Short mmCIF file of C-alpha atoms and ligand atoms in Angstrom, two decimals:
data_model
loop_
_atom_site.label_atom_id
_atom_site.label_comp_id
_atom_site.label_asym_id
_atom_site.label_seq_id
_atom_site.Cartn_x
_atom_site.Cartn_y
_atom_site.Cartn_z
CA UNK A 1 4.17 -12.90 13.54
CA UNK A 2 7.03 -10.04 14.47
CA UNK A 3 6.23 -7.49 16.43
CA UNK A 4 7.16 -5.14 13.65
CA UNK A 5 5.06 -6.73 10.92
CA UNK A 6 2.18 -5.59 13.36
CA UNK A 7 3.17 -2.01 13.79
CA UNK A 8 3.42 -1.72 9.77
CA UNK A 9 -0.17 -3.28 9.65
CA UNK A 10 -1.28 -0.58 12.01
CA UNK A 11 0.42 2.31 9.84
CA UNK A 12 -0.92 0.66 6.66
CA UNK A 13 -4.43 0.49 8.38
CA UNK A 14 -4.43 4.19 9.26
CA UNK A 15 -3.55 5.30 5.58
CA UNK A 16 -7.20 4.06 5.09
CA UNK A 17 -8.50 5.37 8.35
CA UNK A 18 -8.62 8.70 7.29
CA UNK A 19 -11.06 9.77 10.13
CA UNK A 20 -9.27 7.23 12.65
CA UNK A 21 -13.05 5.99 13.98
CA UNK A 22 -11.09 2.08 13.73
CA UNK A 23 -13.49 1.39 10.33
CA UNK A 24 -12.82 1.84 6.91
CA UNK A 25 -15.72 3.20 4.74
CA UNK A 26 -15.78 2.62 0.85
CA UNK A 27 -15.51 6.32 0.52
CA UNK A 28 -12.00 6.15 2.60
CA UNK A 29 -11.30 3.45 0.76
CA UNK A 30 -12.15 5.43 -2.83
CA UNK A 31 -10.09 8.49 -1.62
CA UNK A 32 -7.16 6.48 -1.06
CA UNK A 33 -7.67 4.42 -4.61
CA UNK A 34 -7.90 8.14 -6.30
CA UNK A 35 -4.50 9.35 -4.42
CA UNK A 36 -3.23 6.06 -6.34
CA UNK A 37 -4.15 7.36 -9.75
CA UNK A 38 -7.04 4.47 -9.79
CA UNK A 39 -10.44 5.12 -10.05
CA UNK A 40 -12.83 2.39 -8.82
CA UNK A 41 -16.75 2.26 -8.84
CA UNK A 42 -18.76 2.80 -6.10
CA UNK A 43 -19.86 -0.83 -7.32
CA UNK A 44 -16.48 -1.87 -7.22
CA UNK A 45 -15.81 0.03 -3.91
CA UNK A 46 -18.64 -2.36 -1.94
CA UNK A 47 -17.46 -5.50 -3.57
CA UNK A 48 -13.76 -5.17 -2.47
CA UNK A 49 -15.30 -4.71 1.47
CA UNK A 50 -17.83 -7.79 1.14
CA UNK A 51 -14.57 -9.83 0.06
CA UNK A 52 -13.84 -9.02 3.48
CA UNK A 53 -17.07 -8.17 5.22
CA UNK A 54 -16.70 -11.21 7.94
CA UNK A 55 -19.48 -9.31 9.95
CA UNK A 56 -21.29 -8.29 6.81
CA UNK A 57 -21.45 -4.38 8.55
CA UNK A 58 -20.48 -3.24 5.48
CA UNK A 59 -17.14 -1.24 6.83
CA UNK A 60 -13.41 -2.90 7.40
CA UNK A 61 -12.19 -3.30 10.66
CA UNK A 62 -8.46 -4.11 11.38
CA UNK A 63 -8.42 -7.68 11.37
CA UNK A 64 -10.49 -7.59 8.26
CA UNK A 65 -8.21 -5.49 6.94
CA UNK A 66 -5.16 -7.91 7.20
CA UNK A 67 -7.37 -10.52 5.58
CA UNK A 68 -7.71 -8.05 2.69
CA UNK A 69 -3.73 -7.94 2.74
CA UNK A 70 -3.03 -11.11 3.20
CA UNK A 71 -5.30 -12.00 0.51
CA UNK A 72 -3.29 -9.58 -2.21
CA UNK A 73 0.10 -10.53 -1.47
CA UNK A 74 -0.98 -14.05 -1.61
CA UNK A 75 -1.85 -13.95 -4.80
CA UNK A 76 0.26 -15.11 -7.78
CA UNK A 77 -2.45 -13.83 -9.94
CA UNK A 78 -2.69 -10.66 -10.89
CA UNK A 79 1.14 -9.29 -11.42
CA UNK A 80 -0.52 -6.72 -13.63
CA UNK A 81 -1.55 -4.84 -10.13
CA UNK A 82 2.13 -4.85 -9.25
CA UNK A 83 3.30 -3.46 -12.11
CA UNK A 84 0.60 -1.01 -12.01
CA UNK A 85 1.53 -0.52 -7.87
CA UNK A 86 5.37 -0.29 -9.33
CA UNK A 87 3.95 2.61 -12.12
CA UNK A 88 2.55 4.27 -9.38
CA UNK A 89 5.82 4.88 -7.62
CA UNK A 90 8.15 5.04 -10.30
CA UNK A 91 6.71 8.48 -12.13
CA UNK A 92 9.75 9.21 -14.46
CA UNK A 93 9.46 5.41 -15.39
CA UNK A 94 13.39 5.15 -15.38
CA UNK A 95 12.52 1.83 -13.79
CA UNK A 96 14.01 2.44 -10.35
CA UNK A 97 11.93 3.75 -7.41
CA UNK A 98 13.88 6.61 -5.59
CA UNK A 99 13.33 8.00 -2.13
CA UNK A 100 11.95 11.33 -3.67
CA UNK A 101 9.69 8.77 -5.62
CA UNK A 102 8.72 7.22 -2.64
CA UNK A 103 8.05 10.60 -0.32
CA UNK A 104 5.94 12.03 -3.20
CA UNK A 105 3.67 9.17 -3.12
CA UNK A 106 3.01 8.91 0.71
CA UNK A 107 2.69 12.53 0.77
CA UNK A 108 -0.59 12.35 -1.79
CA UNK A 109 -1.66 9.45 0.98
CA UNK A 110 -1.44 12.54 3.42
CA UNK A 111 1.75 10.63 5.12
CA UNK A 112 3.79 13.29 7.00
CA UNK A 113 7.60 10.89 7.01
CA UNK A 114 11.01 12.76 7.78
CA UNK A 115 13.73 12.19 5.29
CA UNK A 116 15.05 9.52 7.51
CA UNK A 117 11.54 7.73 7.13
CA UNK A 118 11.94 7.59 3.94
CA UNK A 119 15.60 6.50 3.43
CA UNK A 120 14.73 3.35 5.77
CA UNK A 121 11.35 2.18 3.56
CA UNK A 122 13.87 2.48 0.68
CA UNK A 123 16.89 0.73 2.86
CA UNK A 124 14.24 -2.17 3.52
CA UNK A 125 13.04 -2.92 0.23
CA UNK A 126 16.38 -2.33 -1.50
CA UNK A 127 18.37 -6.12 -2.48
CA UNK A 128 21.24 -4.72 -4.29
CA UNK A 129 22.65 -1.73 -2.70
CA UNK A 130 22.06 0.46 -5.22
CA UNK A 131 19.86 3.22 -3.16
CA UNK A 132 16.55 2.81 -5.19
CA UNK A 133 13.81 -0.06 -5.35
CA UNK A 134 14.10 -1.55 -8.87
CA UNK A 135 11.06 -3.74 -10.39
CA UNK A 136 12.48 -7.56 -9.10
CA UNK A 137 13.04 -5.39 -5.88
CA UNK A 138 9.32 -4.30 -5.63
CA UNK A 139 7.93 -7.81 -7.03
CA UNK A 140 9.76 -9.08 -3.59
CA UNK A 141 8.53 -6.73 -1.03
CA UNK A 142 4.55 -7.04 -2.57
CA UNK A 143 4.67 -10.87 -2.06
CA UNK A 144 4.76 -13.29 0.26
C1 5U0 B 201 7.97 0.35 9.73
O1 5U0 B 201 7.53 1.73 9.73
C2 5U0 B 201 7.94 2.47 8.70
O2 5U0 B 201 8.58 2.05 7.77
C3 5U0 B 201 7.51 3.92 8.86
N1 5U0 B 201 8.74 4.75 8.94
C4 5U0 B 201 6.60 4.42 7.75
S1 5U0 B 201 5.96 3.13 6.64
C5 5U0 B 201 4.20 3.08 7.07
C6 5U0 B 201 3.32 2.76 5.93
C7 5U0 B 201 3.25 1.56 5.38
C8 5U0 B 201 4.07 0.38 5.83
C9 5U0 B 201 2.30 1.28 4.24
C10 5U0 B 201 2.62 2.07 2.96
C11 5U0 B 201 3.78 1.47 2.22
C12 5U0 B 201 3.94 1.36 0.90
C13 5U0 B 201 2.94 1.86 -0.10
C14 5U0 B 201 5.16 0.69 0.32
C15 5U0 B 201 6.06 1.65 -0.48
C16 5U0 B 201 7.51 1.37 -0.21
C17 5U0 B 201 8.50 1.22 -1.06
C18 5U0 B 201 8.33 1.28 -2.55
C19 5U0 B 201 9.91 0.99 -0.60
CA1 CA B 202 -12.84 5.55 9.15
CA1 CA B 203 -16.89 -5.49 8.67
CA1 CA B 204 11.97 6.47 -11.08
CA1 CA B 205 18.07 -1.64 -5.49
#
């Protein structure tokens, strides 16, 4: 485990902490689905927590929260939700995820990132060289 995998966890983990109390509710984690474009039950809300629940107290706290990550990327079912996660980004559907694509999105998460931030996210997950995340691209950086 890299130091920097952690501090990505930790940014990932307050995008759902919207209050920053160290818990995500199913309402934070409904307001965050909604800024996605999805639009989940409150049914479907408490069964994607008690996948995680380990204490059964009904919230997610950070290291349930990387068992909920772990769990998605780890998948190999379910490539639907990564083209729907790649739809998401990609709004003109061109097929290639720029870094206005990508600052538009984290914006509606309520992400304040300086142009910079955004170049390097886009550096990261970028293979080719060509300046924008394409779908093979995205398929990489969403799996382990
Ligand atoms: C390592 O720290 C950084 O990269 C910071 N400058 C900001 S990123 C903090 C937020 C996260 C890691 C979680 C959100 C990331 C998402 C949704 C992936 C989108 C990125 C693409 C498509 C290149
Ligand atoms: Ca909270
Ligand atoms: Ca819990
Ligand atoms: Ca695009
Ligand atoms: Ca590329």
């Amino acid at each position: 485990l890299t130091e920097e995998q952690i501090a990505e966890f930790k940014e990932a983990f307050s995008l759902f902490d919207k209050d920053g109390d160290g818990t995500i509710t199913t309402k934070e984690l409904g307001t965050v689905m909604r800024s996605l474009g999805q639009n989940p039950t409150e049914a479907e809300l408490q069964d994607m927590i008690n996948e995680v629940d380990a204490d059964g107290n009904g919230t997610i706290d950070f290291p349930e929260f990387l068992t909920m990550m772990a769990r998605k990327m780890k998948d190999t079912d379910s490539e639907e939700e990564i083209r729907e996660a790649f739809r998401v980004f990609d709004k003109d559907g061109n097929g290639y995820i720029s870094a206005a694509e990508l600052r538009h999105v984290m914006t509606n998460l309520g992400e304040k990132l300086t142009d910079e931030e955004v170049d390097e996210m886009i550096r990261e997950a970028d293979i080719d060289g060509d300046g924008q995340v394409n779908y093979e691209e995205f398929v990489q950086m969403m799996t382990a």
